[PDB]
Amino acid sequence: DLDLAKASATDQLKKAKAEAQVIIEQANKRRSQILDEAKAEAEQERTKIVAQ
Amino acid sequence: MNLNATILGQAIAFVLFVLFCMKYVWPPLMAAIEKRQKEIADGLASAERAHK
Numbered sequence: 001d002l003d004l005a006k007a008s009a010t011d012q013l014k015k016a017k018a019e020a021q022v023i024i025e026q027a028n029k030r031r032s033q034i035l036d037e038a039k040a041e042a043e044q045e046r047t048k049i050v051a052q
Numbered sequence: 053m054n055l056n057a058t059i060l061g062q063a064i065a066f067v068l069f070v071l072f073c074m075k076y077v078w079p080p081l082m083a084a085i086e087k088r089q090k091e092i093a094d095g096l097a098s099a100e101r102a103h104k
Binding site (some may be wrong): 001002006035 | 098099103
């Protein structure tokens, strides 16, 4: 039982420690995409203003 | 029945079997039994500690 709990411990930390970063990476990726849209649109509406 | 000097000879035989027993017989046997008991107690104690 002492053998088994150690193995489970190591494996569970293996999952959790990395998955925190994979979700944070998904967060950062969507951040980058959203900022791409934001800057593109903030530029694009200058066209409407100048034509106005 | 009839009291005898034997009550005195037997007091020698008695005391001597108590000293040799007290020194050699009892201490090692109790040592071995306690050595088994401690091992099983503390082994399982370690088992329930790691489980939590």
